[PDB]
Symmetry: C2
Subunit: 141 residues, 2 copies
């Protein structure tokens, strides 16, 4: 409905694409649609970030199966808040959300480490991808 001194939407999309954004292997919205889970849930959002090459500086696979690390916990929480429109979201609430998945055997925390968790549900059968395959697509060593 209006233009800025510099940069159209086409430019915006191209610039983000060049930064490897907007192409997660496992988009949360699509995954929620596939499972009919309704509104996006935290574990699905984490999978989207983990399969989005542009997010590797703040959340990444460790290379061991479905183990991952929140390199920058605050940034993960900020993005979750933005996606769900929850401005009060912070690491505190994020971590509580992660601990909630323990009992449900969806995500577990790695002992002896900090900020390292692991999906423990059968994502291979759900997604159709092995961790090794995703690591390869995302250049994880």
């Amino acid at each position: 409905m209006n233009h800025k001194p510099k940069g159209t939407f086409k430019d915006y999309v191209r610039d983000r694409a060049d930064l490897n954004k907007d192409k997660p292997v496992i988009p949360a919205a699509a995954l929620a649609g596939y499972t009919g889970s309704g509104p996006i849930q935290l574990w699905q959002f984490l999978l989207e970030l983990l399969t989005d090459k542009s997010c590797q500086s703040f959340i990444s696979w460790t290379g061991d199966g479905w183990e991952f690390k929140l390199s920058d916990p605050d940034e993960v929480a900020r993005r979750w808040g933005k996606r769900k429109n929850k401005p009060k979201m912070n690491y505190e609430k994020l971590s509580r959300g992660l601990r909630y998945y323990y009992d449900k055997n969806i995500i577990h925390k790695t002992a002896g480490k900090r900020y390292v968790y692991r999906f423990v549900c059968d994502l291979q059968s759900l997604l159709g991808y092995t961790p090794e395959e995703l690591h390869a697509m995302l250049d994880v060593k």
Copy 2:
């Protein structure tokens, strides 16, 4: 976390792709991010549907500039409701949202027709696409001459 008797997520994505779904030229979420509108707005959602090849059976460009038509008003409303978690969304409520855009000069309704509207804001400068370019990309067949 679990498997269904048929089809993994990878298969689900592939099958939707073969139906020309999930690749709108103008994704609403992206446009909201670009414009800094926060939540998706109805006008942005309509642009998404209009640039999504798989939605042409219920909403499409007429071929006249930024004019479009709702072939299935309820389906447009149903999808809008799903995107905003408003299950009661119907054309009655959607049209109320469309009339709102009138005085805002965002979308006007074509006189003489019932389900035909037209974006009247400068989308060329905003999007970086001319209507002809988008029509070409979406294989649009105008209703006027054809």
